[model samples]
Target: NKSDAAAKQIKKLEEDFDGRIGVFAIDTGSGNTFGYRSDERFPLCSSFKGFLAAAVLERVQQKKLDINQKVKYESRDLEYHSPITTKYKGSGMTLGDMASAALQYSDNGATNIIMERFLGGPEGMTKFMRSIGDNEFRLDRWELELNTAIPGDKRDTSTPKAVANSLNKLALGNVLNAKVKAIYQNWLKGNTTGDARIRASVPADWVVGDKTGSCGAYGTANDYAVIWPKNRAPLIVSIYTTRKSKDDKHSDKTIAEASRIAIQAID
Candidate 1:
């Protein structure tokens, strides 16, 4: 079928990286989908922070949580890659602000704080995913450790197809209230970490927002996005990669090149 051709193209790209790559993309206007090993599981890495923010927003919409509530933590609470939250220690940051930091900057400290203070930790976040009818997504551990990205381990992992579907649900489907959806969308659009991944492949004129992940092990890295082309309906896409060796570095070029092929498949 048509997807087979795209899959072959993606496979050829994977050859140069010496790793396996997964991609799933949808053209909403034409209802066309292209995938290459999209069902295979890949570590969520920092990407789960995006969904965490969405889950918190859902709670805010239901009035179960206040978006403006302040969270204060000590220096001891900080985790690696906590650039934004590190400056706010003791002084405190609001829940919404923490989510923004987590999503936009991939701030691990803000993510853990939100997880512990509101969502009840990893189990709670996974429950939120289940509530949204996303059975293929799971978060089994906290960050830092969760980013281990062991080759065969299923912990804190999801498939490329599942990620793309869930992003679609949060971004454009009926899963979120209007106000909170805008907040989440804005946070994703302002993301500071995905410059070399999917964002690099998309045309500059296209309105693209994305979340990126890097596990720093097993060559595992990923990115998922919602792209708004001026001439067509929005497209949703996810690209994930992993290699056989634990010390292998993740490849932004591989993910970027693969994204170009994925998008071209349905362009």
Candidate 2:
């Protein structure tokens, strides 16, 4: 009943928003959770890249690949989405190096490099998600290329609940070791984007690290991350919004306000 009322409050906000909005929140320390359309899937845009670094490292767990090894590069690998190609295009990359660039900048070029070199695209990413207790999320398109996918072509997607589950597993060191998880957090912390969404109004004592995605052409925007309340329960929230125009800033404002409400609404 508590979460139901919370969801309703979130729903009222969604009704006035310009796009479809879904949210999932969890009390990671207590295991209590809340959701509004948690099961509904939405386009991830670049947010799906949240799973990239760990998936790249999954090769290490099986001794199938080494992070220290070099990743050969090509001219065609360059893309406009991230700093990777602009910074390391003519240079080389390793598995670990690529993961760092991918996570830190949400680098589409780095994202695609690791995906094609190590994993096998959607199927490979899906397997990685399943290994970490997520089944409903799908990584069907590579970044940049997702922009060109025509009607009926699969694009990346994830439900709020699915990403929330993955967040819990990641926060608890289940998907990877604590050391690696920390490394992801470090990358997430340095991420210079997405400040307008979940991190907009966090308290002074809180720490917010999140990933963002926006496809102006497709009207998709997303934010997913954990907010630590210092002396209280950590908040894990994932929000996704999609529509048919661009006002991505409005979508972000909706996420920001709804997040504050969710935090205050918690009992």
Candidate 3:
């Protein structure tokens, strides 16, 4: 009942924004839910880093790696569209720092490095994704220029359902050990892309851990996050949008409006 209303509201908002939009939300307490085209897959952009982080955390839990372990790198390791990794000059940083920067600032180079170390390169990342129940998510061949050497038809792709499931596991501490979980939470707390989307609609005191992704040319805007609302049920929300103009502010606006509609539907 509530889910249907929320979905309608999200659809209306998407129409208002004049862009392709998708949303999935679940409130654990009251069982309120909503989704609009949530099953569709699109380029995840930097949002893929969240899954990369999860893979790293999983390895740490298996005792295959350590977060405190240092990793080396050079300028060649940097990727285009990354700010911190390109600007920072050094041999490299620890795996922990790489993960931190990836989530905190959506650092592409840091993410690639972490993915390489834990997954043993692109092939290893593919294997890890398979292990995590993502059968359809694949990396495109040309996209390999960015990270992961694997070749395919498109950049990394995923649905809101997959993203939401990944976040729920992370929040439940099911993916890694306590120490690694603590580090993940610490890094997640530093996420800076919260001014729009799911974060925009919640109360100021709510705890939101999320990641955002934007593909400049494809008009891909994505955010997948978990909301811990004070004195209320926790919610896992995922929104994916694409096929719009780069100059469009619809990304932020889409998130903010969806959040408002979601809140109203739940109430």
Give the number of the best model, judged by lDDT. 1
Top-TM-score structure, candidate number: 1
Say which prediction, candidate 1 or candidate 2, comes out ahead on lDDT. 1
- Given candidate 3, what's the lDDT at residue 126? 62
Q: Which stretches of candidate 2 lie over 4 Å from their true place?
A: 1-5, 147-155, 245-250
- For candidate 2, the 10 contiguous residues with the lowest summed lDDT are 145-154
TM-scores for all predictions: 0.97, 0.88, 0.85
Model 3 stretches with alpha carbons more than 4 Å out: 75-77, 141-155, 244-250, 263-267
Q: Which residue pairs overlap in candidate 2's backbone?
A: none
Model 3, 169-191: lDDT tens digits are: 67553566677776676666568
- By lDDT: ranked, best first: 1, 2, 3
Model 2 residue-pair collision total: 0
lDDT of 1 at 239: 95
- Which candidate would rank higher by lDDT, 2 or 3? 2
lDDT of 1 by residue, 1-267 (tens): 556777888888888778999899999888889888889999999999989989989989999988899888875658888999989886888888989899999999999988988999999999999998889999999989998998789999999999998999998888888888998888889999999999899889988889999999999999999998888899998999998899999999999999988998987
